[PDB]
């Protein structure tokens, strides 16, 4: 396309809602991060309050000393896995046939617990759901029960076949992202009709650059405590950054607050509020009843 037309009747949630119910909006891509799992009690470490250098998350420091990470994963391992309204909102996109993909930075598996399938989902920074023996000639797969027993056991996970470290299938800082990230990205962004960016300040690459892969005509909604993805005034000096505010704004909308309240309010414009109220209440209760 490469031509910057305005398909949104206005730059609001209401504008996006009408667009979302137009015949033109059929393929929706969500980009999510830690902001959508904070109300589940998983902290984000770039939040000023309740946030944590980043050696723990770096791969070189993991290799030498794997123990710091595992001792923390324990601290942070949640008692219950209860997806949020923001997640169940993405489940509604799926069921209603709008969800092309959810591209997530989180490793918490909550997208899957809300009922997104592998096909719907790009765990760009991997996940805890499965773990693998790091030994190249082994690569034995272990599930979260096992990995959790080790973590909560406070025993460093060792492969039962070769005794090499068993690492959670998460991508560390310094590591390459999974290959499907790029194969999906190259296909998905050709025919996306709406970009739904939720609970990420977009300060991790290459993830952050996904917004620029969107055609210049795709509307982009941000749901977040603060604005993000605007081009830096100095690095811009050396494309497709967010524009909520300039006079050349035409497709970017910021809804600032909690993702659970934004997704709730967006559902209300769409006439989904009840479904979403039922779903969350029923899935939570189902989880409460394990």
């Amino acid at each position: 396309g490469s031509q910057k037309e305005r398909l949104l009747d206005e730059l609001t949630l209401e504008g996006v809602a009408r667009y979302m119910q137009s015949e033109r909006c059929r393929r929706v891509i969500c980009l999510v991060g830690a902001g959508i799992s904070t109300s589940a009690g998983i902290p984000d470490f770039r939040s000023p309050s309740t946030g944590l250098p980043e050696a723990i998350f770096e791969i070189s420091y993991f290799k030498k000393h794997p123990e710091p990470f595992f001792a923390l994963a324990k601290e942070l391992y949640p008692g219950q896995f209860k997806p949020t309204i923001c997640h169940y909102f993405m489940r509604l996109l799926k069921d209603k046939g709008l969800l092309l993909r959810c591209y997530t930075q989180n490793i918490d598996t909550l997208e899957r617990i809300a009922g997104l399938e592998q096909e719907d989902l790009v765990e760009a920074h991997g996940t805890f759901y499965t773990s693998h023996c790091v030994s190249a000639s082994c690569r034995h797969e272990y599930p979260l029960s096992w990995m959790k027993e080790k973590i909560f056991s406070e025993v460093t996970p060792k492969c039962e076949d070769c005794q090499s470290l068993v690492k959670p299938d998460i991508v560390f800082f310094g590591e390459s992202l999974p290959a499907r990230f790029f194969s999906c990205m190259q296909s998905d962004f050709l025919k996306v009709d709406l970009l739904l960016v939720m609970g990420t300040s977009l300060q991790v690459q290459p993830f952050a650059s996904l917004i620029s892969k969107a055609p210049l005509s795709t509307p982009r909604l941000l749901i977040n405590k603060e604005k993000a993805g605007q081009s830096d005034p100095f690095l811009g000096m050396i494309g497709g950054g967010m524009d909520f505010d300039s006079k050349k704004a035409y497709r970017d909308v910021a809804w600032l607050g909690e993702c659970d309240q934004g997704c709730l309010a967006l559902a209300e414009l769409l006439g989904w509020k009840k479904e979403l109220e039922d779903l969350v209440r029923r899935e939570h209760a189902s989880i409460d009843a394990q």
Binding site: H125, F172, F173, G174, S176, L177, A208
Partner: peptide
């Protein structure tokens, strides 16, 4: 590229 703060 590779996961990194930027």
């Amino acid at each position: 590229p590779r996961k990194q703060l930027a």
